[PDB]
Amino acid sequence: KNGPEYASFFAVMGASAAMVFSALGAAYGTAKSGTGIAAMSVMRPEMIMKSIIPVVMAGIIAIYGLVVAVLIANSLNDGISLYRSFLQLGAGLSVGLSGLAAGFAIGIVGDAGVRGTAQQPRLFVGMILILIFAEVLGLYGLIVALILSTK
Amino acid sequence: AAGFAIGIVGDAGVRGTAQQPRLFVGMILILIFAEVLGLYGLIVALILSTK
């Protein structure tokens, strides 16, 4: 019933890596695309409220990591089983590094999308469509992090 | 991670703010989403420390 004394180490590393790596992915999504905002806006100041969609899609990636970091931090107890702690560790890596991938993908296509939108606004209806498919990579990692922390 | 985001956007944002003052409304709006990464790290550090 009662687990070993070292058992809570792995599940804690699932709580931290779900927040560290997802914020690192949301760092690249905000920084790489925020560079593209200031480079575009010197010639087209009108599109500056429409172009902040790649930086809020990266913000959802942080909340994807914030939720499961709460989910793991509420399944924690003194002397949990070693089976349960590996679940929360495998849940945390599957949302952090996947959100790291989705955040790195949002930052690249968000930066390149707002550069070409300054030269043609017809890219704007296509830029969001590629930004959708980059954002579901975080959601795919989220829904597998939930099914690992459910058990 | 949050200091990386404020570092890059704070660098390139004040370059475009001089050449155009219209960016100032947009620049501080990106810095909101740049700072909450450290703020989201707070409330998970809080909820881990109450236990």
């Binding site: 809020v56 | 909450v36 703020l39 989201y40 707070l42």
Partner: peptide
């Protein structure tokens, strides 16, 4: 009916998950 569904969905969710981040940023 087409654009008022998708554009006002942005106004709802940025209030909805925004209110938690607004609450947390008062720390």
């Amino acid at each position: 009916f087409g654009d008022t569904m998708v554009h006002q969905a942005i106004h709802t969710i940025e209030y909805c998950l925004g209110c938690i981040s607004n609450t947390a940023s008062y720390l």
